Amino acid sequence: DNQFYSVEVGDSTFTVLKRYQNLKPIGSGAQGIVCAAYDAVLDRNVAIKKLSRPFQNQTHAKRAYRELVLMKCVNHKNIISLLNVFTPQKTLEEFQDVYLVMELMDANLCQVIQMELDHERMSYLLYQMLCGIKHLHSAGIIHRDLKPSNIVVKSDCTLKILDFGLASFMMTPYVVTRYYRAPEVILGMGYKENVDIWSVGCIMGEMVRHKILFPGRDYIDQWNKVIEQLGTPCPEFMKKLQPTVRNYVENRPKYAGLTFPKLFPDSLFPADSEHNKLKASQARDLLSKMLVIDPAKRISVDDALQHPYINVWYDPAEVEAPPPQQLDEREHTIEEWKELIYKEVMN
Ligand SMILES: O=C1c2ccccc2-c2n[nH]c3cccc1c23
């Protein structure tokens, strides 16, 4: 009595439990391919993500295992919830693919970016974003890899962050995105919680300009786009850079960097009225507090959530609450990773 059936979607095959019906493509990325589907058991729509051979490389396998262990433990209204996990393969020897069933959303942030939002929507999206980051932080997790493709939303303006971020060489088709990586994390500097504020900043700025703030072919080219617009960091900051780095950085063409009002003119914001003009200045202020090269001066999540522009949706229940009560860290080989993932999936 088999409980699986296969269907073609995109240029790949999905083999799932019969409960999942009428699958339909909805995008793809690095971690894998995703589908939309109706779940007859729960009588609702779900998102089904297929991880093909997650154990193929160390990093890829650590990501899968981690996301899998944390997706069952944490449970915040802004973190994507895992509904079910399964593999069609029935023995460790044959074990190949893993399927994650999650709540279905209507679009990722890349799409939202392509459009304009009113101050009310934009601030709400940002509120939920920072709120999710605060929950992760209080659980000892610091993302460090927040980007628009990792965030999804629904029509009712609800938002959820997908993966849990970062914890070897790679040549796979997976892009080398790093446009959203904080400066300190780039120049090998150490980092802290507020390292995520920089990403939110890049994302917020991108939702306003509708363009990647810092387009960089390579981590070297990116640093330029950063300095050009934001200007060169203060000497003190440099004193904090490693010799090998402070050298390259301090010998890099200096820059004044365009002011914030210029970087985010009133034309990118609704200037309908005084209320909107006032809201546009408060957004600009928030951006100038998050897009700070030197983290020492960059605002924190708790402060960002109190910012006038965001404060509007504050709620002491969704912010200050008791976070969740197996955390690996040892490197393993492909084979060990495959059994670890398999045992996890099989429980
Ligand atoms: O990539 C998407 C995605 C992309 C566009 C629209 C909805 C979703 C969506 N809804 N739930 C999940 C769970 C994981 C990934 C994704 C989703």
PDB file of all heavy atoms in Angstrom, residues 31 49 62-72 82 100 162-165:
ATOM      1  N   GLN A  31      18.691  26.662  -1.860  1.00  0.00           N
ATOM      2  CA  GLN A  31      18.303  25.521  -1.027  1.00  0.00           C
ATOM      3  C   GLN A  31      17.496  24.482  -1.834  1.00  0.00           C
ATOM      4  O   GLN A  31      17.611  23.275  -1.595  1.00  0.00           O
ATOM      5  CB  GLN A  31      17.482  26.022   0.177  1.00  0.00           C
ATOM      6  CG  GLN A  31      17.266  25.004   1.313  1.00  0.00           C
ATOM      7  CD  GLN A  31      18.304  25.107   2.426  1.00  0.00           C
ATOM      8  OE1 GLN A  31      18.542  26.196   2.967  1.00  0.00           O
ATOM      9  NE2 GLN A  31      18.921  23.977   2.778  1.00  0.00           N
ATOM     10  N   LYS A  49       8.655  22.115  -0.393  1.00  0.00           N
ATOM     11  CA  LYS A  49      10.007  22.382  -0.839  1.00  0.00           C
ATOM     12  C   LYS A  49      10.820  21.096  -0.932  1.00  0.00           C
ATOM     13  O   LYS A  49      10.924  20.353   0.028  1.00  0.00           O
ATOM     14  CB  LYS A  49      10.648  23.354   0.138  1.00  0.00           C
ATOM     15  CG  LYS A  49      12.087  23.686  -0.128  1.00  0.00           C
ATOM     16  CD  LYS A  49      12.547  24.718   0.879  1.00  0.00           C
ATOM     17  CE  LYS A  49      13.817  25.393   0.408  1.00  0.00           C
ATOM     18  NZ  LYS A  49      14.418  26.209   1.502  1.00  0.00           N
ATOM     19  N   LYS A  62      24.790  20.862   6.509  1.00  0.00           N
ATOM     20  CA  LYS A  62      24.700  21.468   7.829  1.00  0.00           C
ATOM     21  C   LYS A  62      23.498  22.382   7.842  1.00  0.00           C
ATOM     22  O   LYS A  62      22.811  22.504   8.838  1.00  0.00           O
ATOM     23  CB  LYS A  62      25.963  22.270   8.127  1.00  0.00           C
ATOM     24  CG  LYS A  62      26.097  22.690   9.577  1.00  0.00           C
ATOM     25  CD  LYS A  62      27.431  23.389   9.852  1.00  0.00           C
ATOM     26  CE  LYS A  62      27.626  23.612  11.351  1.00  0.00           C
ATOM     27  NZ  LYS A  62      28.861  24.396  11.649  1.00  0.00           N
ATOM     28  N   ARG A  63      23.265  23.032   6.710  1.00  0.00           N
ATOM     29  CA  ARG A  63      22.143  23.944   6.532  1.00  0.00           C
ATOM     30  C   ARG A  63      20.832  23.170   6.628  1.00  0.00           C
ATOM     31  O   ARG A  63      19.920  23.556   7.362  1.00  0.00           O
ATOM     32  CB  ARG A  63      22.226  24.619   5.157  1.00  0.00           C
ATOM     33  CG  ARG A  63      21.060  25.569   4.837  1.00  0.00           C
ATOM     34  CD  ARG A  63      21.362  27.010   5.269  1.00  0.00           C
ATOM     35  NE  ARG A  63      20.628  27.985   4.458  1.00  0.00           N
ATOM     36  CZ  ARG A  63      20.976  29.263   4.322  1.00  0.00           C
ATOM     37  NH1 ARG A  63      22.047  29.743   4.947  1.00  0.00           N
ATOM     38  NH2 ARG A  63      20.269  30.063   3.532  1.00  0.00           N
ATOM     39  N   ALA A  64      20.737  22.081   5.873  1.00  0.00           N
ATOM     40  CA  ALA A  64      19.524  21.270   5.886  1.00  0.00           C
ATOM     41  C   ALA A  64      19.210  20.756   7.295  1.00  0.00           C
ATOM     42  O   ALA A  64      18.113  20.985   7.817  1.00  0.00           O
ATOM     43  CB  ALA A  64      19.647  20.103   4.915  1.00  0.00           C
ATOM     44  N   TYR A  65      20.172  20.068   7.905  1.00  0.00           N
ATOM     45  CA  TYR A  65      19.987  19.521   9.242  1.00  0.00           C
ATOM     46  C   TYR A  65      19.552  20.600  10.249  1.00  0.00           C
ATOM     47  O   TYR A  65      18.593  20.407  11.017  1.00  0.00           O
ATOM     48  CB  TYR A  65      21.271  18.864   9.732  1.00  0.00           C
ATOM     49  CG  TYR A  65      21.150  18.267  11.126  1.00  0.00           C
ATOM     50  CD1 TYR A  65      20.384  17.121  11.355  1.00  0.00           C
ATOM     51  CD2 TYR A  65      21.776  18.873  12.225  1.00  0.00           C
ATOM     52  CE1 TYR A  65      20.241  16.596  12.628  1.00  0.00           C
ATOM     53  CE2 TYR A  65      21.639  18.351  13.508  1.00  0.00           C
ATOM     54  CZ  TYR A  65      20.872  17.218  13.700  1.00  0.00           C
ATOM     55  OH  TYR A  65      20.727  16.706  14.975  1.00  0.00           O
ATOM     56  N   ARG A  66      20.266  21.725  10.238  1.00  0.00           N
ATOM     57  CA  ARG A  66      20.000  22.830  11.136  1.00  0.00           C
ATOM     58  C   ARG A  66      18.607  23.406  10.889  1.00  0.00           C
ATOM     59  O   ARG A  66      17.786  23.524  11.796  1.00  0.00           O
ATOM     60  CB  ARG A  66      21.082  23.890  10.949  1.00  0.00           C
ATOM     61  CG  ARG A  66      20.917  25.179  11.744  1.00  0.00           C
ATOM     62  CD  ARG A  66      22.271  25.893  11.907  1.00  0.00           C
ATOM     63  NE  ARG A  66      22.163  27.221  12.515  1.00  0.00           N
ATOM     64  CZ  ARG A  66      21.699  28.300  11.877  1.00  0.00           C
ATOM     65  NH1 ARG A  66      21.295  28.218  10.606  1.00  0.00           N
ATOM     66  NH2 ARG A  66      21.627  29.466  12.509  1.00  0.00           N
ATOM     67  N   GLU A  67      18.321  23.748   9.646  1.00  0.00           N
ATOM     68  CA  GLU A  67      17.025  24.311   9.372  1.00  0.00           C
ATOM     69  C   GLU A  67      15.961  23.315   9.812  1.00  0.00           C
ATOM     70  O   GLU A  67      14.937  23.693  10.361  1.00  0.00           O
ATOM     71  CB  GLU A  67      16.893  24.662   7.893  1.00  0.00           C
ATOM     72  CG  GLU A  67      16.554  26.149   7.669  1.00  0.00           C
ATOM     73  CD  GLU A  67      17.659  26.926   6.961  1.00  0.00           C
ATOM     74  OE1 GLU A  67      17.877  26.662   5.757  1.00  0.00           O
ATOM     75  OE2 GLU A  67      18.308  27.789   7.598  1.00  0.00           O
ATOM     76  N   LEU A  68      16.220  22.036   9.601  1.00  0.00           N
ATOM     77  CA  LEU A  68      15.267  20.996   9.975  1.00  0.00           C
ATOM     78  C   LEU A  68      15.060  20.876  11.497  1.00  0.00           C
ATOM     79  O   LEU A  68      13.933  20.711  11.962  1.00  0.00           O
ATOM     80  CB  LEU A  68      15.735  19.663   9.417  1.00  0.00           C
ATOM     81  CG  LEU A  68      14.764  18.490   9.333  1.00  0.00           C
ATOM     82  CD1 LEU A  68      13.603  18.827   8.415  1.00  0.00           C
ATOM     83  CD2 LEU A  68      15.519  17.264   8.808  1.00  0.00           C
ATOM     84  N   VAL A  69      16.137  20.957  12.276  1.00  0.00           N
ATOM     85  CA  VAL A  69      16.012  20.865  13.732  1.00  0.00           C
ATOM     86  C   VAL A  69      15.386  22.127  14.333  1.00  0.00           C
ATOM     87  O   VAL A  69      14.583  22.046  15.256  1.00  0.00           O
ATOM     88  CB  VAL A  69      17.374  20.633  14.418  1.00  0.00           C
ATOM     89  CG1 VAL A  69      17.243  20.797  15.923  1.00  0.00           C
ATOM     90  CG2 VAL A  69      17.879  19.233  14.103  1.00  0.00           C
ATOM     91  N   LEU A  70      15.736  23.286  13.797  1.00  0.00           N
ATOM     92  CA  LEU A  70      15.211  24.544  14.306  1.00  0.00           C
ATOM     93  C   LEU A  70      13.783  24.867  13.871  1.00  0.00           C
ATOM     94  O   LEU A  70      13.089  25.622  14.551  1.00  0.00           O
ATOM     95  CB  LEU A  70      16.119  25.704  13.886  1.00  0.00           C
ATOM     96  CG  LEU A  70      17.521  25.726  14.496  1.00  0.00           C
ATOM     97  CD1 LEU A  70      18.330  26.838  13.842  1.00  0.00           C
ATOM     98  CD2 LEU A  70      17.421  25.923  15.998  1.00  0.00           C
ATOM     99  N   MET A  71      13.360  24.307  12.744  1.00  0.00           N
ATOM    100  CA  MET A  71      12.036  24.553  12.202  1.00  0.00           C
ATOM    101  C   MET A  71      10.931  23.876  13.010  1.00  0.00           C
ATOM    102  O   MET A  71       9.752  24.198  12.850  1.00  0.00           O
ATOM    103  CB  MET A  71      11.976  24.062  10.756  1.00  0.00           C
ATOM    104  CG  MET A  71      12.491  25.034   9.721  1.00  0.00           C
ATOM    105  SD  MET A  71      11.108  25.704   8.780  1.00  0.00           S
ATOM    106  CE  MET A  71      11.361  24.956   7.125  1.00  0.00           C
ATOM    107  N   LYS A  72      11.317  22.942  13.873  1.00  0.00           N
ATOM    108  CA  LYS A  72      10.347  22.218  14.691  1.00  0.00           C
ATOM    109  C   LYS A  72      10.336  22.792  16.108  1.00  0.00           C
ATOM    110  O   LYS A  72       9.306  22.804  16.786  1.00  0.00           O
ATOM    111  CB  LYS A  72      10.696  20.725  14.717  1.00  0.00           C
ATOM    112  CG  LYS A  72      10.871  20.147  13.326  1.00  0.00           C
ATOM    113  CD  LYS A  72      10.833  18.629  13.280  1.00  0.00           C
ATOM    114  CE  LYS A  72      12.147  18.003  13.704  1.00  0.00           C
ATOM    115  NZ  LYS A  72      12.177  16.524  13.441  1.00  0.00           N
ATOM    116  N   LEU A  82       6.988  24.881   9.802  1.00  0.00           N
ATOM    117  CA  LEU A  82       7.107  23.585   9.156  1.00  0.00           C
ATOM    118  C   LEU A  82       5.888  22.768   9.509  1.00  0.00           C
ATOM    119  O   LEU A  82       5.605  22.567  10.689  1.00  0.00           O
ATOM    120  CB  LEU A  82       8.333  22.874   9.666  1.00  0.00           C
ATOM    121  CG  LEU A  82       8.715  21.592   8.951  1.00  0.00           C
ATOM    122  CD1 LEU A  82       8.891  21.842   7.462  1.00  0.00           C
ATOM    123  CD2 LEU A  82       9.993  21.094   9.574  1.00  0.00           C
ATOM    124  N   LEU A 100       9.950  19.278   2.618  1.00  0.00           N
ATOM    125  CA  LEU A 100       9.501  20.095   3.725  1.00  0.00           C
ATOM    126  C   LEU A 100       8.161  20.712   3.323  1.00  0.00           C
ATOM    127  O   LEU A 100       8.074  21.342   2.267  1.00  0.00           O
ATOM    128  CB  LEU A 100      10.505  21.209   4.019  1.00  0.00           C
ATOM    129  CG  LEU A 100      11.960  20.802   4.339  1.00  0.00           C
ATOM    130  CD1 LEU A 100      12.714  22.049   4.759  1.00  0.00           C
ATOM    131  CD2 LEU A 100      12.023  19.761   5.453  1.00  0.00           C
ATOM    132  N   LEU A 162      12.182  33.023   6.002  1.00  0.00           N
ATOM    133  CA  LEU A 162      12.369  31.632   5.650  1.00  0.00           C
ATOM    134  C   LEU A 162      13.482  30.980   6.476  1.00  0.00           C
ATOM    135  O   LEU A 162      13.280  30.693   7.640  1.00  0.00           O
ATOM    136  CB  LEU A 162      12.618  31.482   4.138  1.00  0.00           C
ATOM    137  CG  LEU A 162      11.440  31.792   3.196  1.00  0.00           C
ATOM    138  CD1 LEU A 162      11.827  31.531   1.724  1.00  0.00           C
ATOM    139  CD2 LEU A 162      10.227  30.927   3.586  1.00  0.00           C
ATOM    140  N   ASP A 163      14.657  30.770   5.899  1.00  0.00           N
ATOM    141  CA  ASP A 163      15.773  30.119   6.593  1.00  0.00           C
ATOM    142  C   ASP A 163      16.221  30.772   7.931  1.00  0.00           C
ATOM    143  O   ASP A 163      15.681  31.795   8.369  1.00  0.00           O
ATOM    144  CB  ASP A 163      16.954  30.069   5.643  1.00  0.00           C
ATOM    145  CG  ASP A 163      17.698  31.376   5.603  1.00  0.00           C
ATOM    146  OD1 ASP A 163      17.035  32.411   5.402  1.00  0.00           O
ATOM    147  OD2 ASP A 163      18.940  31.372   5.791  1.00  0.00           O
ATOM    148  N   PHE A 164      17.227  30.174   8.570  1.00  0.00           N
ATOM    149  CA  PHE A 164      17.763  30.674   9.835  1.00  0.00           C
ATOM    150  C   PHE A 164      19.141  31.299   9.694  1.00  0.00           C
ATOM    151  O   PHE A 164      19.773  31.648  10.692  1.00  0.00           O
ATOM    152  CB  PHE A 164      17.803  29.559  10.889  1.00  0.00           C
ATOM    153  CG  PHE A 164      16.448  29.107  11.319  1.00  0.00           C
ATOM    154  CD1 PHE A 164      15.645  28.369  10.470  1.00  0.00           C
ATOM    155  CD2 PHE A 164      15.946  29.474  12.559  1.00  0.00           C
ATOM    156  CE1 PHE A 164      14.351  27.998  10.835  1.00  0.00           C
ATOM    157  CE2 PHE A 164      14.650  29.109  12.940  1.00  0.00           C
ATOM    158  CZ  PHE A 164      13.850  28.366  12.070  1.00  0.00           C
ATOM    159  N   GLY A 165      19.596  31.432   8.449  1.00  0.00           N
ATOM    160  CA  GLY A 165      20.870  32.060   8.166  1.00  0.00           C
ATOM    161  C   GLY A 165      22.064  31.146   8.178  1.00  0.00           C
ATOM    162  O   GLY A 165      21.932  29.943   8.092  1.00  0.00           O
TER     163      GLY A 165
END
